[PDB]
Amino acid sequence: REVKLLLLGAGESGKSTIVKQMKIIHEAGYSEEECKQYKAVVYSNTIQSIIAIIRAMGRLKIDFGDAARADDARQLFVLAGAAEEGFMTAELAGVIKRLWKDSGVQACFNRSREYQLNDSAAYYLNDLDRIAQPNYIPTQQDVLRTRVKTTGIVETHFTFKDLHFKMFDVGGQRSERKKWIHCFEGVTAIIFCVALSDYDLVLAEDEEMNRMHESMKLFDSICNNKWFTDTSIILFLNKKDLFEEKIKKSPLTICYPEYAGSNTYEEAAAYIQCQFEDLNKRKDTKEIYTHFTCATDTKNVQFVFDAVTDVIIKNNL
Numbered sequence: 001r002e003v004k005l006l007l008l009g010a011g012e013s014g015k016s017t018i019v020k021q022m023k024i025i026h027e028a029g030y031s032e033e034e035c036k037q038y039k040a041v042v043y044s045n046t047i048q049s050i051i052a053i054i055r056a057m058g059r060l061k062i063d064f065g066d067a068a069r070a071d072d073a074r075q076l077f078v079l080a081g082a083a084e085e086g087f088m089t090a091e092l093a094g095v096i097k098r099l100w101k102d103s104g105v106q107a108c109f110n111r112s113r114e115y116q117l118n119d120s121a122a123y124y125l126n127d128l129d130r131i132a133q134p135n136y137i138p139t140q141q142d143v144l145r146t147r148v149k150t151t152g153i154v155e156t157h158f159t160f161k162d163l164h165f166k167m168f169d170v171g172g173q174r175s176e177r178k179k180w181i182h183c184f185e186g187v188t189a190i191i192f193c194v195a196l197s198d199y200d201l202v203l204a205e206d207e208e209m210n211r212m213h214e215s216m217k218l219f220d221s222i223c224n225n226k227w228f229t230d231t232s233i234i235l236f237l238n239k240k241d242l243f244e245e246k247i248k249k250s251p252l253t254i255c256y257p258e259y260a261g262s263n264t265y266e267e268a269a270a271y272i273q274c275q276f277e278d279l280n281k282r283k284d285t286k287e288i289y290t291h292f293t294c295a296t297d298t299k300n301v302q303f304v305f306d307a308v309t310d311v312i313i314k315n316n317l
């Protein structure tokens with residue numbers, strides 16, 4: 001028997017990562033040939049990241065700690081080109097490593113909410129020595145951490161618990177939402193993704209709009225849509241891992257002014273949950289299956305997705 005799952009959510013919420021986990025958890029994961037295709041994407045992400053932080057250093061006016069880096073920066077752009085073609089010279093590695101360790105670069109890094117930087121920036125930059133070895137091969141984790149904008153409709157297939165799953169993943173930026181209506185026919189369940197750690201960020205598409213707020217508006221829309229009435233609405237409060245660290249230093253009031261709880265994971269998490277479920281207009285007839293997740297964490301996605309299958313099975317079957 002078949003089952004159609006449609007992954008939805010604003011930009012960079014984690015939809016695609018959940019899709020990669022399906023291959024890792026139900027298929028043997030990514031082969032060598034496949035992990036090598038992602039080698040270029042890992043090198044691209046690393047350069048984009050370090051360059052992106054360097055750019056911000058100019059707009060926020062942040063000097064390198066050791067002017068010595070001024071030349072590493074200049075060399076960064078000279079050698080950068082290779083990374084994009086899937087190669088990482090030993091020289092490039094050193095330049096990126098030195099800039100990354102610079103106090104100036106670091107101060108700008110801790111202020112990333114003030115601009116746009118890839119969540120997986122630190123993950124790679126802190127593993128430069130590994131991803132820079134000759135004949136380097138991306139690991140399951142490296143592949144899960146890759147960032148590639150999803151534009152259009154990606155369709156994935158896999159078999160789990162005797163069911164033949166058909167998973168649909170789409171883009172989430174404002175410009176990509178006009179395409180959502182293409183995956184609406186016969187949806188067994190929707191897995192709506194929300195980046196928990198976006199409470200203090202702003203849409204890349206519109207500086208003035210708070211990311212968490214955009215997400216809420218999208219949830220209110222789908223969830224309350226008459227059309228998806230008999231469609232299991234699964235809510236994934238993703239990026240719980242990043243949220244856990246951010247809630248320690250970044251005030252949740254930025255997003256929810258009337259939040260009188262502490263800067264700890266449990267109170268902050270539960271609050272954001274109630275906010276999203278409160279958008280549900282038919283609280284008695286419609287039900288929302290929620291799960292806190294870490295899309296990059298395979299163990300976590302496996303048990304979470306296991307729990308989701310039972311519900312999908314105990315229902316639409």
Ligand SMILES: Nc1nc2c(ncn2[C@@H]2O[C@H](COP(=O)(O)OP(=O)(O)O)[C@@H](O)[C@H]2O)c(=O)[nH]1
Nearest residue numbers: 012013014015016017144145146147239294295
């Ligand atoms: N640390 C961390 N990174 C995540 C998580 N979920 C997604 N990411 C990363 O965030 C970036 C964007 O996510 P992606 O899966 O492309 O989401 P989509 O664009 O909304 O489908 C990717 O580089 C992911 O690896 C999570 O729970 N924790």
Ligand code: ALF
Nearest residue numbers: 011012150171172
């Ligand atoms: F960044 Al997404 F699907 F919203 F690519």
Ligand SMILES: [Mg+2]
Nearest residue numbers: 015016150170
């Ligand atoms: Mg996507």
